Design an enzyme around this catalytic site. Sequence first.
Site, PDB file in Angstrom:
ATOM      1  N   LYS A  12       0.899  -1.120   0.051  1.00 29.65           N
ATOM      2  CA  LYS A  12      -0.224  -0.037   0.042  1.00 29.65           C
ATOM      3  C   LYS A  12       0.934   1.386   0.130  1.00 29.65           C
ATOM      4  O   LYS A  12       2.093   1.163   0.358  1.00 29.65           O
ATOM      5  CB  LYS A  12      -0.816   0.012   1.311  1.00 29.65           C
ATOM      6  CG  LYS A  12      -1.684  -1.355   1.379  1.00 29.65           C
ATOM      7  CD  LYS A  12      -2.840  -1.255   2.208  1.00 29.65           C
ATOM      8  CE  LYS A  12      -3.701  -2.319   1.724  1.00 29.65           C
ATOM      9  NZ  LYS A  12      -4.841  -2.787   3.044  1.00 29.65           N
ATOM     10  N   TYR A  56     -11.848  -3.352  -5.893  1.00 31.05           N
ATOM     11  CA  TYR A  56     -12.650  -3.356  -4.792  1.00 31.05           C
ATOM     12  C   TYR A  56     -14.112  -3.231  -5.090  1.00 31.05           C
ATOM     13  O   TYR A  56     -14.889  -2.813  -4.246  1.00 31.05           O
ATOM     14  CB  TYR A  56     -12.362  -2.465  -3.751  1.00 31.05           C
ATOM     15  CG  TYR A  56     -10.836  -2.597  -3.342  1.00 31.05           C
ATOM     16  CD1 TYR A  56     -10.596  -3.513  -2.285  1.00 31.05           C
ATOM     17  CD2 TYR A  56     -10.007  -1.661  -3.805  1.00 31.05           C
ATOM     18  CE1 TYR A  56      -9.125  -3.540  -1.805  1.00 31.05           C
ATOM     19  CE2 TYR A  56      -8.584  -2.000  -3.140  1.00 31.05           C
ATOM     20  CZ  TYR A  56      -8.168  -2.788  -2.178  1.00 31.05           C
ATOM     21  OH  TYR A  56      -7.028  -3.162  -1.742  1.00 31.05           O
ATOM     22  N   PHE A  92     -17.891   2.677   3.646  1.00 32.16           N
ATOM     23  CA  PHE A  92     -16.491   2.779   3.659  1.00 32.16           C
ATOM     24  C   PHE A  92     -15.671   2.694   2.117  1.00 32.16           C
ATOM     25  O   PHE A  92     -14.428   2.689   2.107  1.00 32.16           O
ATOM     26  CB  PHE A  92     -15.597   1.949   4.738  1.00 32.16           C
ATOM     27  CG  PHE A  92     -15.388   0.544   4.121  1.00 32.16           C
ATOM     28  CD1 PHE A  92     -14.347  -0.061   3.353  1.00 32.16           C
ATOM     29  CD2 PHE A  92     -16.441  -0.237   4.415  1.00 32.16           C
ATOM     30  CE1 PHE A  92     -14.295  -1.172   3.436  1.00 32.16           C
ATOM     31  CE2 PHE A  92     -16.477  -1.595   4.075  1.00 32.16           C
ATOM     32  CZ  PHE A  92     -14.998  -2.134   3.436  1.00 32.16           C
ATOM     33  N   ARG A 106      -0.234 -15.471   3.878  1.00 28.90           N
ATOM     34  CA  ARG A 106      -1.152 -15.030   5.059  1.00 28.90           C
ATOM     35  C   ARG A 106      -0.390 -15.052   6.343  1.00 28.90           C
ATOM     36  O   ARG A 106      -0.958 -14.416   7.497  1.00 28.90           O
ATOM     37  CB  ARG A 106      -2.501 -15.694   4.800  1.00 28.90           C
ATOM     38  CG  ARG A 106      -3.320 -15.407   3.947  1.00 28.90           C
ATOM     39  CD  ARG A 106      -4.229 -14.549   4.166  1.00 28.90           C
ATOM     40  NE  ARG A 106      -5.019 -14.819   5.417  1.00 28.90           N
ATOM     41  CZ  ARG A 106      -5.991 -15.652   5.498  1.00 28.90           C
ATOM     42  NH1 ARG A 106      -6.390 -16.237   4.527  1.00 28.90           N
ATOM     43  NH2 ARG A 106      -6.592 -16.046   6.644  1.00 28.90           N
ATOM     44  N   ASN A 128      -4.373  -2.810   6.034  1.00 31.91           N
ATOM     45  CA  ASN A 128      -3.247  -3.422   6.639  1.00 31.91           C
ATOM     46  C   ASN A 128      -2.055  -2.799   6.024  1.00 31.91           C
ATOM     47  O   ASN A 128      -2.144  -1.939   5.069  1.00 31.91           O
ATOM     48  CB  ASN A 128      -3.291  -4.986   6.283  1.00 31.91           C
ATOM     49  CG  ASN A 128      -2.366  -5.766   7.341  1.00 31.91           C
ATOM     50  OD1 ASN A 128      -1.399  -5.182   8.043  1.00 31.91           O
ATOM     51  ND2 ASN A 128      -2.429  -7.152   7.315  1.00 31.91           N
ATOM     52  N   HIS A 179      -1.260  -6.538   1.492  1.00 31.61           N
ATOM     53  CA  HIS A 179      -2.400  -7.230   0.983  1.00 31.61           C
ATOM     54  C   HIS A 179      -1.977  -8.690   0.537  1.00 31.61           C
ATOM     55  O   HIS A 179      -1.072  -8.776   0.180  1.00 31.61           O
ATOM     56  CB  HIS A 179      -3.001  -6.559   0.018  1.00 31.61           C
ATOM     57  CG  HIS A 179      -4.189  -7.244  -0.794  1.00 31.61           C
ATOM     58  ND1 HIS A 179      -5.501  -6.837  -0.265  1.00 31.61           N
ATOM     59  CD2 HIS A 179      -4.260  -8.242  -1.683  1.00 31.61           C
ATOM     60  CE1 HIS A 179      -6.592  -7.697  -1.284  1.00 31.61           C
ATOM     61  NE2 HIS A 179      -5.607  -8.490  -1.882  1.00 31.61           N
ATOM     62  N   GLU A 218      -8.115 -11.981  -8.123  1.00 30.44           N
ATOM     63  CA  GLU A 218      -7.136 -10.890  -8.193  1.00 30.44           C
ATOM     64  C   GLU A 218      -5.816 -10.779  -8.879  1.00 30.44           C
ATOM     65  O   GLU A 218      -5.411  -9.473  -9.397  1.00 30.44           O
ATOM     66  CB  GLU A 218      -6.815 -10.619  -6.447  1.00 30.44           C
ATOM     67  CG  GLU A 218      -8.033 -10.477  -5.620  1.00 30.44           C
ATOM     68  CD  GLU A 218      -7.819 -10.324  -4.280  1.00 30.44           C
ATOM     69  OE1 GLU A 218      -6.547 -10.983  -3.881  1.00 30.44           O
ATOM     70  OE2 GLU A 218      -8.671  -9.760  -3.434  1.00 30.44           O
TER      71      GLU A 218
END
Lengths: 111, 125, 125, 111
Positions: free
Chosen positions: C13, C53, C61, C89, C97, C100, C111
């Site tokens: 991110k 998304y 949100f 994970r 977070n 991702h 994805e």
Amino acid sequence: ERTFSIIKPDAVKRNLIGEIYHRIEKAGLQIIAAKMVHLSEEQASGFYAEHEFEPLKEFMTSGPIMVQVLEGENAIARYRELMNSVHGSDSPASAAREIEFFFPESEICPR
Amino acid sequence: GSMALERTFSIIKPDAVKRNLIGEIYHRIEKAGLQIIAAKMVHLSEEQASGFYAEHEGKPFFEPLKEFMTSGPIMVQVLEGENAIARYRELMGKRYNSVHGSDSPASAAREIEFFFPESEICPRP
Amino acid sequence: GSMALERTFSIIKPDAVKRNLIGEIYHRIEKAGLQIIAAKMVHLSEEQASGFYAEHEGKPFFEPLKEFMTSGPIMVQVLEGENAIARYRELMGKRYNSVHGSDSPASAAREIEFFFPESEICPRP
Amino acid sequence: ERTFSIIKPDAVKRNLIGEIYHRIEKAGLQIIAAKMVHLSEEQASGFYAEHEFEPLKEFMTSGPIMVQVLEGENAIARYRELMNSVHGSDSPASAAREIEFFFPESEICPR
């Protein structure tokens, strides 16, 4: 029946305090206690101690926030339906723990 | 990095708090370039209203002025921005107004230190 | 020649890209047996973040989640290895977070195909 | 001032992408554009056309590589002193030719 609210640093920095407050007072609730605090690492940890998370503490401490207590006939339901970007209590007795975390009775002003 | 940075004090009198106009006044302040770096809701008393307006003790309108600012909770804020003294004064136009604002830097300094300690002022960065 | 081979998707991110943590995250991924077989740096937009998304359009949100993933450049990769879904994970522990990762094979398939065509996936041999 | 970099297939295969990237971001540079490509015979020939050599093309096409653009105050000198195993631009205007060979402006992401 009173609820709890937190304006996240995104809206405070972007100068959105008036819009959030105006959208509430027009909905029926009344701001009966409020103050602007800048949370620290220990402060944000205590309010979010039910996790123990790290990236959430950094965002909630990245700037000042607008804490406030809201009053009105059935607020927990009216508040949750009004509104992430803003905090709000999910159930009663969860607002009581969050209100007491930020507000003593000497800082709450009934109308 | 302008040096025209200055802060001004602001009070939302109980008539506007009782009528639930806090958000409408905040929005007009934010839409004019100003920013709220310090704010809280307090309910003044005979002892506290006398200290703030202590410059008007001998005037025959003190006893009621003290009685109006203690009839309900108020909202006190510190507004920051370039030329915030004149910008906020221009917002309200210019004793018993809908809102309160500082008229000079020395007045803003004395009125901010009465309601807010430095530990309650929150810089935006 | 294990059949536990699988690929997972990963995003760094903008908060970690702006802080220059790309190498520190890559090293933790490589030290856990995983391998980067596809990667690129992109800067999402309102149109692209809404498609990825898209499963969260009705949630209140969405508008900010779209606004966070478009505040800066990101790093998207395809990590490969034995049980790469669970291994990656477990690396991050388990919305906003530091990194991702895919939570299921069907999620990893959907994805990966959004950011990478097959012509951009590079097998290691 | 931005420079150019190529992670040779030896480090990509040995899973050394994180070490090479971490040793840079700690030095001051910032990865502002990157992608993993597997060069072909014509691709490796074009980037290395200033020779025309054959054994070098076979090694640079024997596996995927990590191409990236680096930004920072005086990078050509800072990069060359940081580091064969890794490529790097020797002089300016040589980085401009190598960056434009792999990267259009639509693929470069200023911070």
